Amino acid sequence: SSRCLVRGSVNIDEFFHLPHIVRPGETISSTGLTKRAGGKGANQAFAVARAGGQVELDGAIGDDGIWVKEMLESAGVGTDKLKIVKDEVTGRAVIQSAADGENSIVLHAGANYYLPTSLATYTHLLVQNEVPLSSTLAYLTAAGQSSPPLTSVFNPSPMLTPAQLREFPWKHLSWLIVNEGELGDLLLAFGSSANPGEAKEDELQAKASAGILELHENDYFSKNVGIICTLGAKGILCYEPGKEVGYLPAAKLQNPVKDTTGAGDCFAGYFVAGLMSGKSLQDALKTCLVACGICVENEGAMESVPTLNAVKERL
Amino acid sequence: STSSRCLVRGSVNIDEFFHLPHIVRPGETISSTGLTKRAGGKGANQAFAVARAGGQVELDGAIGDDGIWVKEMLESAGVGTDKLKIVKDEVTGRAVIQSAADGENSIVLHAGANYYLPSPTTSLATYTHLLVQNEVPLSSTLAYLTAAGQSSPPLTSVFNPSPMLTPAQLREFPWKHLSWLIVNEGELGDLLLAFGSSANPGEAKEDELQAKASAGILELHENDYFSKNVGIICTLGAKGILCYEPGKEVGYLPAAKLQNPVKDTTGAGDCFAGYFVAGLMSGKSLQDALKTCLVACGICVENEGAMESVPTLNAVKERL
Numbered sequence: 032s033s034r035c036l037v038r039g040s041v042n043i044d045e046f047f048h049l050p051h052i053v054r055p056g057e058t059i060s061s062t063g064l065t066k067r068a069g070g071k072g073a074n075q076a077f078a079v080a081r082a083g084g085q086v087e088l089d090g091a092i093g094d095d096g097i098w099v100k101e102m103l104e105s106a107g108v109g110t111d112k113l114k115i116v117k118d119e120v121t122g123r124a125v126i127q128s129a130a131d132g133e134n135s136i137v138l139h140a141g142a143n144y145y146l147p148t149s150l151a152t153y154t155h156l157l158v159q160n161e162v163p164l165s166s167t168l169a170y171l172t173a174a175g176q177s178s179p180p181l182t183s184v185f186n187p188s189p190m191l192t193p194a195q196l197r198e199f200p201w202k203h204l205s206w207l208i209v210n211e212g213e214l215g216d217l218l219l220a221f222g223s224s225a226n227p228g229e230a231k232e233d234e235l236q237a238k239a240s241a242g243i244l245e246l247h248e249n250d251y252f253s254k255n256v257g258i259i260c261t262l263g264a265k266g267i268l269c270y271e272p273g274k275e276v277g278y279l280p281a282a283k284l285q286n287p288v289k290d291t292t293g294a295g296d297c298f299a300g301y302f303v304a305g306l307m308s309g310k311s312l313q314d315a316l317k318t319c320l321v322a323c324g325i326c327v328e329n330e331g332a333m334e335s336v337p338t339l340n341a342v343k344e345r346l
Numbered sequence: 347s348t349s350s351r352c353l354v355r356g357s358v359n360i361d362e363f364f365h366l367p368h369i370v371r372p373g374e375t376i377s378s379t380g381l382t383k384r385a386g387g388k389g390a391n392q393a394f395a396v397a398r399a400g401g402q403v404e405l406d407g408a409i410g411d412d413g414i415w416v417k418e419m420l421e422s423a424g425v426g427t428d429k430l431k432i433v434k435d436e437v438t439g440r441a442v443i444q445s446a447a448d449g450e451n452s453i454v455l456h457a458g459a460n461y462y463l464p465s466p467t468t469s470l471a472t473y474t475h476l477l478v479q480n481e482v483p484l485s486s487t488l489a490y491l492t493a494a495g496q497s498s499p500p501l502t503s504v505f506n507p508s509p510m511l512t513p514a515q516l517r518e519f520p521w522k523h524l525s526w527l528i529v530n531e532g533e534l535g536d537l538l539l540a541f542g543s544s545a546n547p548g549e550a551k552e553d554e555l556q557a558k559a560s561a562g563i564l565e566l567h568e569n570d571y572f573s574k575n576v577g578i579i580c581t582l583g584a585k586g587i588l589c590y591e592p593g594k595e596v597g598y599l600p601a602a603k604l605q606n607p608v609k610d611t612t613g614a615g616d617c618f619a620g621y622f623v624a625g626l627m628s629g630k631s632l633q634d635a636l637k638t639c640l641v642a643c644g645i646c647v648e649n650e651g652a653m654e655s656v657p658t659l660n661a662v663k664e665r666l
């Protein structure tokens with residue numbers, strides 16, 4: 032029976048409501064404060080658990096993050112490997128929400144970057160780039176050098192440097208999940224002329240399909256890595272290694288788009304869970320799209336992620 | 347001549363210093379290089395410095411239970427905390443401060459318990475001096491000034507308008523009830539601008555700053571929106587201070603020469619305000635109060651942190 036390990040981040044997002052973005056030398060009083068749990072690790076782990084899979088999160092928070100740990104636990108995330116680091120704070124995004132509409136963000140890595148694991152009980156590894164890359168590399172290498180090798184899924188967010196991308200051990204990767212702009216960052220770092228980030232909507236699907244094939248056949252990459260490219264409201268592109276590139280449209284929404292926050296983390300978590308359930312690849316993707324549809328119809332990051340029953344009720 | 351006792355009506359903050367390359371610009375995302383969390387708040391900082399300077403002081407305000415370690419830090423320094431309430435289901439006020447490598451800082455305040463006002467709505471019976479800022483609700487600051495000014499005899503009340511009040515609030519402010527206004531050059535400009543002046547002492551060049559601030563003080567003194575009984579202190583950072591006693595000349599004193607490199611200038615203004623009130627409380631002459639303030643502030647900027655860099659009176663005496 033399948034079990035996923037997420038090696039990734041936990042963030043508290045702090046929205047300070049302000050008349051205007053604070054200027055240098057200025058003291059200004061916020062008129063309200065909203066907190067939202069986040070982080071690519073925590074979001075995607077939450078989605079895996081909401082989709083019904085057994086998942087554990089490997090990372091660190093501060094004492095100020097226990098309420099997020101409890102939120103993950105309540106959703107079924109294993110948090111036994113979620114360490115509390117004294118004298119560090121949970122990763123933080125300090126967001127200034129101005130009445131001008133203009134926003135400004137300050138990111139603080141915090142306990143996500145704390146650097147002081149047997150993978151034998153795990154079948155899947157989920158990683159991103161919001162913890163130290165050495166940690167992600169070490170976990171990815173360990174998944175690939177296991178007997179048998181673990182199914183590993185990588186979401187390069189935030190994007191790695193061109194130097195980091197070219198020296199990345201892609202041979203150890205079962206799945207790469209990106210959006211069209213992140214696909215363009217990889218192709219650009221690998222000498223490609225095309226960047227499907229600046230594509231027009233009419234060209235997007237075809238140019239991103241071509242970018243997937245080109246990345247597959249690029250010397251810096253590996254030919255054994257499956258590639259999923261998410262396209263927001265246009266859907267997803269999927270390349271199974273050695274098959275043909277498939278397009279699936281986004282699920283038809285039953286409600287207005289409220290908020291697209293967490294849509295890609297919702298996809299990643301539901302995808303790993305679909306792999307763990309032994310479903311066909313296409314059926315795992317279909318469940319992702321329906322889950323992501325519910326996700327963009329609801330407010331919040333984690334809070335918007337539907338339960339499998341909710342996904343099945345729509346299906 | 348009675349024993350001096352100071353009531354500080356003001357804020358307690360948990361300060362979060364995010365170390366950044368520059369102050370974040372609208373639309374930009376930027377990563378901090380480090381975070382320092384420390385006790386702060388204008389009320390707590392200034393009350394702390396009064397206690398360090400040897401004065402009898404009590405802080406009147408509110409924290410949340412997440413702030414009890416700040417309350418204990420104040421008690422250890424000799425700040426009286428019986429009137430620092432702990433409000434259930436409330437968090438201590440916060441300052442989110444961008445500390446740029448450039449040098450400039452930017453502060454976002456979250457009021458938290460600092461804006462707790464019991465319903466319904468205090469005696470000033472044993473107090474001679476009242477110190478107030480603007481990090482609690484203005485009605486509370488005003489009610490305390492009214493009470494200080496309506497005592498017999500009236501309390502010596504000192505005001506540091508931080509953060510700056512709105513133009514309307516400044517024009518209806520009871521300046522007649524104030525003994526001392528403590529400001530920096532930028533704040534001096536805010537009052538002047540709110541009172542119909544064209545003078546902009548903050549926007550002056552470094553070569554002319556002392557002269558432009560000196561005139562701005564004399565202009566503020568003579569303004570019909572202000573009051574002629576209020577003494578004015580304008581701090582000028584590394585350039586020193588300006589002092590104005592009503593009807594006298596504006597006096598300039600330079601900053602103390604440092605005996606160690608600059609480590610951190612945060613809290614120097616609050617260190618000054620607290621030492622100034624304590625100097626008044628001791629019955630020292632005004633020049634000796636200011637001279638002690640300057641030496642205290644020289645020590646302050648040689649050390650890290652806001653409260654923790656404030657020297658004890660004995661430490662200041664070793665330099666004098």
Ligand SMILES: Nc1ncnc2c1ncn2[C@@H]1O[C@H](COP(=O)(O)OP(=O)(O)O)[C@@H](O)[C@H]1O
Pocket residue numbers: 209210261262263264265266267281282284288291293294295296298319320323324327
């Ligand atoms: N506007 C939208 N309408 C419908 N579905 C959406 C919308 N935005 C996102 N989704 C769904 O969520 C998935 C992931 O969204 P996407 O924007 O590509 O993620 P990312 O945050 O990585 O950019 C999409 O492939 C789609 O199924």
Ligand SMILES: Nc1ncnc2c1ncn2[C@@H]1O[C@H](COP(=O)(O)OP(=O)(O)O)[C@@H](O)[C@H]1O
Pocket residue numbers: 529530581582583584586587600601602608611613614615616618639640643644647
């Ligand atoms: N860079 C500095 N070098 C030396 N003394 C300083 C420096 N900055 C501040 N001080 C001392 O601290 C006092 C108050 O600092 P200032 O910057 O004017 O306060 P505020 O934070 O209220 O603007 C100054 O008058 C001076 O005596």
Ligand code: NA
Pocket residue numbers: 210262263
């Ligand atoms: Na998108």
Ligand code: NA
Pocket residue numbers: 530531581582583584
């Ligand atoms: Na200054």
